Amino acid sequence: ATTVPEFPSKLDWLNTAPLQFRRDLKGKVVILDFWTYSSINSMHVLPDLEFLEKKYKDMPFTVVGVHSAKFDNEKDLDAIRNAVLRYDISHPVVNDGDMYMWRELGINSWPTFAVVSPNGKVIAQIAGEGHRKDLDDVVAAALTYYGGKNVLDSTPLPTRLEKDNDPRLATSPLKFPGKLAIDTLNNRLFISDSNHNRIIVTDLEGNFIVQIGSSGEEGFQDGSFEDAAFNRPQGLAYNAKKNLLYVADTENHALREIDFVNERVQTLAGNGTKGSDYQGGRKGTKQLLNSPWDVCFEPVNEKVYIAMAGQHQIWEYSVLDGITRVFSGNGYERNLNGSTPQTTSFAQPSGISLGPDLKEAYIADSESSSIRALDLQTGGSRLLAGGDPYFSENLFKFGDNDGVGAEVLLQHPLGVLCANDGQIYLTDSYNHKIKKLDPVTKRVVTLAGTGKAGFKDGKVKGAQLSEPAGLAITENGRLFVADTNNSLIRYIDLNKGEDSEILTLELKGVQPPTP
Ligand SMILES: [Cl-]
Ligand SMILES: [Cl-]
Numbered sequence: 024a025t026t027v028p029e030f031p032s033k034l035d036w037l038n039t040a041p042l043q044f045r046r047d048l049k050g051k052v053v054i055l056d057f058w059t060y061s062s063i064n065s066m067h068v069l070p071d072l073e074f075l076e077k078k079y080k081d082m083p084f085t086v087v088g089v090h091s092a093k094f095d096n097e098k099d100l101d102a103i104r105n106a107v108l109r110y111d112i113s114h115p116v117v118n119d120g121d122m123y124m125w126r127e128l129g130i131n132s133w134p135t136f137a138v139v140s141p142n143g144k145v146i147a148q149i150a151g152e153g154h155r156k157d158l159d160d161v162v163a164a165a166l167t168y169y170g171g172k173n174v175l176d177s178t179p180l181p182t183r184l185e186k187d188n189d190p191r192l193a194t195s196p197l198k199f200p201g202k203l204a205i206d207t208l209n210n211r212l213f214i215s216d217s218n219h220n221r222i223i224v225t226d227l228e229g230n231f232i233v234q235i236g237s238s239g240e241e242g243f244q245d246g247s248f249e250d251a252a253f254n255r256p257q258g259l260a261y262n263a264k265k266n267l268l269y270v271a272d273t274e275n276h277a278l279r280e281i282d283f284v285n286e287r288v289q290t291l292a293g294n295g296t297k298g299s300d301y302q303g304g305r306k307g308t309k310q311l312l313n314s315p316w317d318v319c320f321e322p323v324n325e326k327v328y329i330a331m332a333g334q335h336q337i338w339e340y341s342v343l344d345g346i347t348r349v350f351s352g353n354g355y356e357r358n359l360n361g362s363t364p365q366t367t368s369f370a371q372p373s374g375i376s377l378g379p380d381l382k383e384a385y386i387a388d389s390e391s392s393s394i395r396a397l398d399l400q401t402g403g404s405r406l407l408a409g410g411d412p413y414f415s416e417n418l419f420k421f422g423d424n425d426g427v428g429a430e431v432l433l434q435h436p437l438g439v440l441c442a443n444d445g446q447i448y449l450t451d452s453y454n455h456k457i458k459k460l461d462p463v464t465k466r467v468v469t470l471a472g473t474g475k476a477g478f479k480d481g482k483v484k485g486a487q488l489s490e491p492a493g494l495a496i497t498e499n500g501r502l503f504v505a506d507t508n509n510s511l512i513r514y515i516d517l518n519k520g521e522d523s524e525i526l527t528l529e530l531k532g533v534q535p536p537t538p
């Protein structure tokens with residue numbers, strides 16, 4: 024039986040004083056969760072771990088999220104810490120950024136659970152999602168067994184939650200805003216205040232108008248604007264014709280309709296449960312979704328296109344008949360461009376935007392680190408920038424680099440926008456940059472930020488962003504950014520070109536959710 028290795032010293036910890044197997048975990052049943060915060064499957068099992076953490080609240084048991092990074096941005100401890108906050112992780116987390124623990128145990132995928140005994144022997148090793156009951160069973164067995172031997176110690180752990188270390192988390196008006204939308208005719212900005220579980224509506228200068236989902240708790244409720252609840256929502260799309268806001272309500276696996284004419288919120292598809300349905304076609308909320316991350320609206324045929332980050336697909340909600348179908352993507356996580364939906368594949372797509380023609384849709388394909396164009400007529404896709412165009416299986420061709428074709432390198436882009444002039448704006452998220460893509464030339468240029476996570480409101484080329492993920496634009500040319508880990512809405516007036524500077528949009532009247 025494998026004896027788990029000790030954690031190396033000068034491995035940083037979050038949510039806790041540094042732990043080790045010989046001093047603090049001796050006498051505990053431990054689940055090692057090998058994860059990385061860019062993995063939607065890693066995200067998919069956090070609620071499994073929350074289940075076990077609550078079930079075994081006052082038993083000698085602990086989850087340790089061994090964060091083994093995929094992307095290079097993910098080795099920075101402050102990146103993981105923002106993820107730990109965004110994801111509501113409260114168990115111990117250690118940044119094993121060079122995968123020492125990963126390799127020593129033989130971990131192959133994300134996520135992968137290693138269950139360790141009070142003595143330090145590895146008694147089970149499970150990979151993949153959908154193993155809540157399997158883990159529930161091992162931990163039960165281990166507990167009632169090693170408790171029979173009387174080798175368990177229920178001394179507390181040196182718990183120091185990161186969310187209890189920051190005064191401003193409660194204070195800031197916005198908590199990790201991710202996605203944006205705009206109503207230029209009536210001059211309104213739509214903010215996905217993700218980790219406040221609400222939707223904030225202001226004016227293009229920054230002035231509060233109305234708040235949808237007022238209690239700020241995580242929940243899943245339809246009804247009035249004060250009674251509604253979301254769960255860390257992400258993408259938004261605005262229906263000018265009917266004065267509606269569509270919400271990709273990611274952690275409820277649902278599509279919500281914010282109805283401003285009637286001041287109510289109603290659910291269009293999904294039901295709070297992560298589906299595993301790859302064809303779809305059912306009506307309204309009979310149809311399950313899976314981590315809808317971005318949503319955009321096509322007003323001619325009245326179609327809502329959903330970037331289904333959970334299943335690597337683009338889906339299509341139809342306003343006329345309330346049906347949600349797969350639109351493109353066969354289900355495998357690949358950077359596979361093909362003529363037909365079934366011969367096409369995405370990699371955790373998280374951003375979707377319609378071109379001015381209304382005939383293509385550009386996709387932030389975060390896990391292949393590429394921008395792609397989905398053909399609305401054929402359900403097929405083409406590669407614009409990034410990715411490994413010779414290997415669809417390759418999901419590790421990332422970096423930071425401007426240019427054309429193979430010269431381009433990105434890193435987990437989350438956000439994409441198509442201006443009415445038909446140029447493409449993206450947030451290279453792990454590079455903390457805004458970048459511009461031209462669809463014809465396929466040339467990508469850095470437009471803002473230095474590549475270094477932080478905050479600074481300077482002249483764009485030396486200014487700073489922290490993991491930006493959302494975009495919206497005016498015809499005047501002001502480009503709003505959702506600067507996520509800075510919990511700020513920036514903006515760039517694009518007219519000024521090489522003279523231009525990124526600013527912060529000060530919000531007037533926007534207060535955090537009552538506690
Ligand atoms: Cl989340
Ligand atoms: Cl069926």
Ligand code: NA
Binds near residue numbers: 202203204258259319
């Ligand atoms: Na959106």
Ligand code: NA
Binds near residue numbers: 293308
């Ligand atoms: Na429902």
Ligand code: NA
Binds near residue numbers: 354355
């Ligand atoms: Na599959």
Ligand code: NA
Binds near residue numbers: 349352353364365
């Ligand atoms: Na298919």
Ligand code: NA
Binds near residue numbers: 399400401402
């Ligand atoms: Na089609």
